[PDB]
């Protein structure tokens, strides 16, 4: 019993403002006096992050997003997405900040990798999988980010200027989708406006659309900061703002609006109030399901076997094999192998920002195959492809002379209110274990005037002789110091490089065996951060010459290479589609060295590999989560059969893209000129050629289908495809695809459409028998912009069933004689 | 002169004033005789004058389509085209010219793509400006259409263009404004689309925010013909003059009711539409001790003289393209063996469709140019056939098949009636009787006192008698709008009267083609005779049109084989192919790039038998040459007026030696163009996608290859230029280029095209941008320095959205220069530190 | 509200008139005939009256809005601001109207047309039929006399000067 009406009449004014605006940066407004509590919300999409970033609570990292769309299993989304709930029961958030469901309209939005796909059919079952599987465990699901936040530059002020029928038709879709099949409890809006309004306070998106239309009864909260006005998003439909504490909704700003007769009544405020009081019900409903504890502990209570092996199998399921001649596929146990590349022994295992999180471990892919085979493998980096150097706390200790024990291992953070006598003493102590450092909550620190200092120190002893490459970034002011003596300045002289300022590096003659002392001090931000790393300095010609010849005396080369989540990050878009540095030369250098070289590539988007034609195999692994490396080797060695398909298409050439022109903010403004032709939507009406298509992945087996039944009602499509896997060795999962075409329609539309998908688990030889019903209207549809309507409209139509959008492999014709205009679900 | 604008705004009567802000008829504003405010005439257009009439109407000088014209890259003769088109009105007794058409191609699929000049708006302000200065150096008003964004026909009285401001502004805008700024059209007429949601005839900002207030121009404003959408609305917002008479939107009832009954408009609004009518007569008045121009004065064709014909040709020889040449197949000599083949060889297309479009002098065919050129008979065959639609019936027809092949008995007769031949009286006499020579009855703007303008309700008995040149099948043909009943021999063979389907005829608005095929005896005599109603005879109709036509049917296999059986036996083979004005054409778009039926199998079998063959291409716009690979020699020859064929032959036999250049890049398909998802008029709109990305602009920032880019044409000889001197103050650029026929046979002129870049702007912009050119004749191993200087703010501004105005950022430039976009052959860098914003000219 | 509208409510709410005839005059800056608030959203929306709009004549002032915006018919004929060429021309250029406003606005007219056609057994009307004083009548005299005595108001009367006896001079 947590009643939202008669708590409604029970609020006083003063409560009720409090109620529409975060208390901080996670939680909701305690108001002891009527038994509503403070709500936490966590991020993200892709596991757990909790309360902090800084010395954060370890946490289940997932694959991204792409990569979890890349599945096409509906039940596998939904285990998912029941197992985040658990995680985040764990960091006590009953309300989580995720799944992301913007649309990769072109390649390098920096956010490309945390939403699902450029479809909306798929991204939708993915996002309704994902938060169906959050609900059922009773914790709280949040879509995000409504709407057309597409890229990040400028996302704050970015005006996406997008026609009715492609808003209709690409963008709205997934929501319309989640909302009428999984009802999430919350959704988030985007930080950017659409067609010259904030969406956090548009009544067409907030009120027309997601209530009157839709009727979904669930809760609005703003991205963060991502409030734009007093009154309008108050009249508009924003329900809360997010963090506090408030900007733009303190007590005296609403009230006086209220008394002044400017723009809101209190009928509005009432409005949004109710839809807090909606969400907060569905969390004290929940919280014997749960076991959340207001304000509660954060623990990593979640990091066990269970959770592992999901995530394992969830990482492995994503992975994408793109090529196999030859059988290069699967590696055998007693190959002779080398392990070389830039991502080999690096842990890429989510995007940047606020989808990452600090992982109970991660396991490289050069891991994965160690613990695949129970020993040492031979390995080379091959080159570097880093955005910045971190990797000194990561590899240093307290006191050298004392083991690599956990407690000794990392650097020590020492804060301090100034940067003094002998005598000030630290008001914050903390084992360091990551390089960059994100800031962070304390007494001695004032909220939102934050100035601290941080004496960051430990013992670097280098494994090698020669040359190594040390770094300072920061945000705010620091400097560098070894053996006590200065060799990098981040103080005096600055340069903007995205608020803080460009890397600063420091080449120095080291020798393996001797201890060193590091020693940062740092300036608060002005809240802050900063980053010191060190790196081994490599002779690039070289090290790309020894990895050849490395290659060419091995039977077989592993190269594992791609971006990371400093190239693919929320804050700013890609430049370019390119892979980073010399990568493109290590690999050129190895295919000619070892012609038999499996390619795996990590990224959350499609990057161009120049030398495609001369690489035999060539695998898609994404960003895995925690369990990334091992989930590599399942594949590779084919204890999992690689069962994934693109969820994005992958153009040869970034030219070759829709959006090329248009994925820029310029003057403040983002021209969808492609309209609906979004993805393979674009590529196949222009026929052109790209390298992978949507919906492609290989396998280890061999598969075939056929409709083999089919009926139309007026109202319905019930259709049944028969799957076989025809081969005798793996067995596998096949993805089965239906996509639907206008064959004389009055409208301009794309070739095909997505609309139903099946994945079907197959011994070899076995034969099995998948249905896949929809209504037509769900099947046929376009958005007609000039009615302001859908229509389902009368002509001939084709079903096609294939592995991929190219892939089709069964076809029938209907005819549908019932003409039908909709609104709504 | 006299004719003073004030004083007769402070004498005019309320009445009066309404009767000026539209037009009377068609082609006439509004006479007022105690004030001495005569009638003004106005006629098409950007290529020729046709003057008062479709039907029946007085011949004229047809010069070359637009994109044609632009090619020439020539501002001085194209200023001398203009001076021509004068004289060519004055003979019409046509005080104002409507055109230059300055729509852009922003793809290729235009129905009036061939009418405008140019994808590039340097190139088509500039080709604007000059055609408007030769024009109004002589007196006679220019009126530059269609203002603004009528880039497709696609459903053009609704059709919502939706573009950027930046787009608007550097692309659509910006021909006009570089018009203004330089040659101060009196006249602009408004598009029939909307842009950004609104009808650009009542568009404030359009009409007056920027025209007004922000170029300052002082011309006059007309409608499109019907392009008026309300009665207020227009009025307060800047829409001076409605055409045609009798008004729709602007009675003295509408009007004055609006006025009388405070509903949008005041009495200011009313003066202030009429001061600038009165500014467009006094242009007029003030000119006619000039011009010679008579009040309702007759229609001569007294221009039609040997100056004229030199001049025409001159114009459209200038205007060919050089596209491929090959193995020296060009030019062609006295000596070669040559066979002329092709749909378009005896065609006399020389024009595209719809109110560009006139009754010429003559028109000589390209087979007619060679002839003439080689003074005997010239092998031919046809090839095939790529019509639309079968014409033919009156320009091969007599009244009287007993007499001679006259230019009296030649034709047919067209007997107009009050009343339907079903039910008049044997005793019912014509109103109107006249010899017709097209087979295209064009009744538009046909004019009686019998026929009321408000309904214009009448019947036409079409006769002749048809005399057939050899045995065999023969296909008749029937197009309306209205009504029509074909009989051979005073049975019915083609019924136009029920069950009409909408189709491609008048405008699109009409119905499709119905024919019947008959077996036909040769010297044999049919009695052909067409019955035919107008519009309002058979919705809200206009007076409408018909077309009767026959064509012999022929084996297409066979001529295909007998064509290359016959080149294989020729030296040399000429191949006059393309499209017409019925596929390009006012009133709807091209469906895709191709050429039409079994042209291209033709090709590919004269390629074949031998590749010693010259293609020479008529087209507006680009059309897919899929066979490119093996056309050795490849010549554009747009659609060239009266002179077309004189000057293909010019070009041909190296008399004029080829100096045009393509003004439209030319992708290799469909698919490959920057509007081939948005050129559809879907939903009532149109989504400027590419925004600025328009041309070459688009293809060069996609490194997209075309098979013949913007600026690209080939000559007889050869050329190299270099940058020869080169000074940038802070508010001027510069440059002279020198340029020397390198070859040792043929004089030649080459075009030089100046290019601008921006090198680390943080606005995107196109690759380069052409902002200069200069065109130079050199004989052989002539050098000559070209001089170009321009403004900064003119060479390197781009339109800031964000700020609603111009901008030249500091920072490093690049000019380039070359003989095409993709032909640069001198660069060099400057620095620009003192930044500008502005607006207006 | 409480004033104008008022006595329109009242009639609409008890008698259900057939007709309603739109002002001259405009109502906050909008003419009447063409003012969605007062034919639409108050008349339909709200009142859900069904009768027909006709313009007082010569009361029109627009040739869509007054058709997208609920006058159903201009008074008098011939039209002004509705001829064949001014609506159709609306339509295909997708000036302010579309097909479905005119349908709109004649369903209205049919309506009108309904209540007469479906009365002509009871009124007996004759379709341009002709003009007859047919009901002057002792009858209707005596209505008419009545309906006028019982309109009088009697201000005053003083000291029994009214009624008048016909024995005063
Ligand atoms: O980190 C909290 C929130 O902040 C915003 O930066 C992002 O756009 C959201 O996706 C995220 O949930
Ligand atoms: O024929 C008069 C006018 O009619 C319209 O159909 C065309 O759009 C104009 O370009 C032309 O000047
Ligand atoms: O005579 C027809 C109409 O004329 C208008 O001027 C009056 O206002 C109406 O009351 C009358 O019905």
């Given at each position: 019993?947590?009643d ?7 609020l ?8 529409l ?7 909701t407004?305690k ?7 403070a709500?936490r919300?966590?991020d993200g999409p892709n596991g757990?992050?909790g ?5 954060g609570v370890?946490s289940?990292?997932?694959p ?6 890349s ?7 939904e285990?998912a ?29 920096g956010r ?8 909306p059919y798929?991204?939708?079952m993915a996002?309704s999988?994902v938060?169906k ?10 879509v995000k ?7 990040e ?26 909302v009428?099949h ?7 809006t ?5 067609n010259?309004?904030?969406?956090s306070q548009?009544?067409?998106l907030?009120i027309d659309?997601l ?6 009864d669930?809760?609005?909260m703003?991205?963060?900061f ?5 009154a309008?998003?108050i ?5 809360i703002?997010?963090p ?16 002044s ?9 009432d409005?949004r ?26 623990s ?8 592992s092996?999901?995530?394992?199998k969830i ?5 994408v094999?793109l090529?196999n001649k030859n059988?290069?596929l699967?590696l ?8 070389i590349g830039?991502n080999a ?5 989510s995007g ?11 396991v ?5 195959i160690?613990?695949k ?11 570097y492809?880093?955005?910045s150097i ?13 083991p ?7 650097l020590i953070a020492?804060?301090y209110?100034?940067?003094?006598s002998?005598d000030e003493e ?7 274990n990551?390089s960059?450092?994100?800031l962070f909550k ?18 670097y ?6 040359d ?5 970034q920061?945000?705010?002011?620091g400097?560098?110091?070894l053996n006590?003596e ?7 002289n600055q340069?903007?490089?995205?608020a ?5 590096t ?5 020798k ?7 020693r ?5 931000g002005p809240?802050g951060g900063?980053?010191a790393?060190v ?10 010459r020894?990895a050849?010849?490395?290659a060419?005396k091995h ?6 290479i ?8 929320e ?5 370019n589609?390119d ?11 190895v ?8 390619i795996?590539?990590?990224s959350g988007?499609?990057?161009?590999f ?5 690489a035999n195999?060539?695998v898609?692994?994404?960003y895995?989560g925690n369990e ?9 060695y084919?204890?999992?059969?690689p069962?994934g398909?693109?969820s994005?298409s992958?153009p040869?050439k970034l ?12 003057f ?6 492609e ?6 939507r ?5 026929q ?7 919906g492609?992945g ?5 598969f075939?289908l ?5 009926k139309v009602?007026?109202?319905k499509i019930?259709?049944?495809?028969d ?5 005798d060795?793996?067995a ?9 075409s206008?064959l004389?329609?009055?409208?301009s539309?794309?070739?095909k459409e ?6 079907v688990?197959?011994e ?13 209207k769900?099947?046929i ?5 000039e009615?302001g ?12 069933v294939?592995?991929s ?17 909709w609104?709504?679900?």
């Amino acid at each position: 019993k947590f009643d939202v009406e008669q708590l409604l009449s029970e609020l006083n004014q003063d409560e009720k403002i409090s109620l529409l605006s975060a208390v901080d940066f996670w939680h909701t407004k305690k108001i002891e006096r009527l038994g509503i509590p403070a709500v936490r919300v966590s991020d993200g999409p892709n596991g757990i992050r909790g309360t902090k970033f800084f010395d954060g609570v370890p946490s289940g990292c997932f694959p991204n997003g792409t990569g979890l769309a890349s599945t096409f299993d509906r039940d596998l989304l939904e285990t998912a997405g029941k197992l985040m709930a658990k995680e985040s029961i764990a960091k006590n958030a009953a309300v989580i900040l995720g799944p992301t469901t913007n649309m990769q309209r072109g390649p390098l939005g920096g956010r490309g990798f945390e939403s699902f796909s450029e479809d909306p059919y798929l991204a939708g079952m993915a996002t309704s999988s994902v938060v169906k599987g959050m609900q059922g465990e009773g914790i709280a699901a949040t879509v995000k980010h409504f709407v057309c936040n597409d890229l990040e530059d400028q996302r704050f002020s970015s005006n996406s200027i997008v026609s009715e029928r492609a808003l209709r038709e690409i963008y709205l879709e997934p929501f319309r989708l989640a909302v009428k099949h999984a009802n999430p409890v919350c959704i988030m809006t985007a930080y950017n406006k659409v067609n010259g309004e904030h969406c956090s306070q548009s009544k067409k998106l907030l009120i027309d659309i997601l209530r009157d239309e839709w009727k979904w009864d669930g809760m609005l909260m703003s991205d963060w900061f991502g409030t734009y006005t007093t009154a309008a998003a108050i009249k508009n439909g924003l329900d809360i703002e997010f963090p506090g504490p408030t900007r733009w909704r303190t007590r005296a700003l609403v009230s006086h609006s209220l008394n002044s007769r400017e723009q809101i009544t209190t009928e509005d405020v009432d409005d949004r109030v109710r839809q807090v009081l909606k969400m907060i019900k569905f969390v004290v409903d929940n919280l014997e399901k749960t076991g959340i504890v207001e304000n509660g502990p954060e623990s990593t209570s979640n990091n066990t076997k269970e959770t592992s092996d999901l995530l394992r199998k969830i990482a492995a399921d994503s992975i994408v094999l793109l090529k196999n001649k030859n059988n290069i596929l699967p590696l055998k146990k007693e190959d002779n192998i080398i392990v070389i590349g830039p991502n080999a022994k690096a842990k890429t295992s989510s995007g940047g920002g606020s989808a990452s999180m600090n992982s109970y471990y991660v396991v490289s892919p050069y891991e994965g195959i160690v613990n695949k085979l129970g020993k040492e493998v031979d390995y080379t980096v091959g080159a570097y492809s880093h955005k910045s150097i971190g990797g000194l706390a990561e590899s240093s200790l307290i006191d050298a002379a004392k083991p690599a024990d956990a407690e000794n291992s990392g650097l020590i953070a020492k804060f301090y209110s100034n940067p003094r006598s002998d005598d000030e003493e630290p008001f914050h102590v903390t084992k360091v274990n990551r390089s960059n450092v994100h800031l962070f909550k304390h007494e001695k620190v004032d909220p939102k005037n934050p100035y601290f200092f941080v004496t960051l120190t430990g013992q670097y002893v280098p494994q090698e002789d020669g040359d190594y490459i040390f770094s300072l970034q920061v945000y705010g002011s620091g400097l560098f110091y070894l053996n006590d003596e200065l060799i990098i300045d981040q103080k005096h002289n600055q340069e903007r490089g995205g608020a803080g300022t460009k890397e600063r590096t420091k080449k120095l003659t080291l020798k393996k065996g001797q201890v060193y002392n590091v020693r940062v001090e740092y300036g608060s931000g002005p809240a802050g951060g900063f980053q010191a790393g060190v790196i081994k300095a490599i002779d690039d010609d070289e090290e790309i010459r020894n990895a050849a010849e490395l290659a060419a005396k091995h039977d077989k080369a592993v190269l594992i290479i791609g971006l990371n989540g400093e190239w693919e990050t929320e804050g700013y878009d890609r430049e370019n589609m390119d892979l980073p540095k010399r990568t493109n030369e290590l690999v050129r250098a190895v295919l000619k060295a070892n012609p038999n070289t499996v390619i795996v590539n990590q990224s959350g988007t499609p990057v161009e590999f120049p030398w495609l034609e001369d690489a035999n195999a060539l695998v898609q692994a994404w960003y895995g989560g925690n369990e990334l490396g091992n989930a590599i080797a399942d594949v590779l060695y084919g204890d999992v059969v690689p069962n994934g398909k693109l969820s994005l298409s992958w153009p040869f050439k970034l030219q070759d893209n829709p959006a090329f022109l248009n994925f820029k903010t310029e003057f403040g403004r983002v021209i969808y000129g492609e309209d609906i032709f979004v993805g393979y939507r674009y590529y196949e009406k222009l026929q052109r050629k790209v390298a992978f298509p949507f919906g492609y992945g290989l396998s280890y087996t061999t598969f075939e289908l056929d409709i083999s039944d089919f009926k139309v009602t007026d109202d319905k499509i019930a259709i049944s495809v028969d799957v076989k896997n025809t081969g005798d060795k793996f067995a596998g999962s096949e993805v089965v695809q239906v996509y639907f075409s206008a064959l004389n329609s009055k409208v301009s539309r794309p070739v095909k459409e997505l609309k139903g998908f099946e994945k079907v688990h197959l011994e070899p030889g076995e034969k099995k028998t998948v249905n896949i019903d929809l209504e037509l209207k769900d099947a046929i549809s376009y958005f007609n912009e000039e009615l302001g309507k859908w229509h389902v409209e009368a002509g001939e139509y084709l079903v096609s069933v294939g592995t991929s959008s190219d892939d089709i492999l069964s076809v029938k014709e209907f005819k549908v004689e019932k003409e039908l205009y909709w609104k709504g679900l």
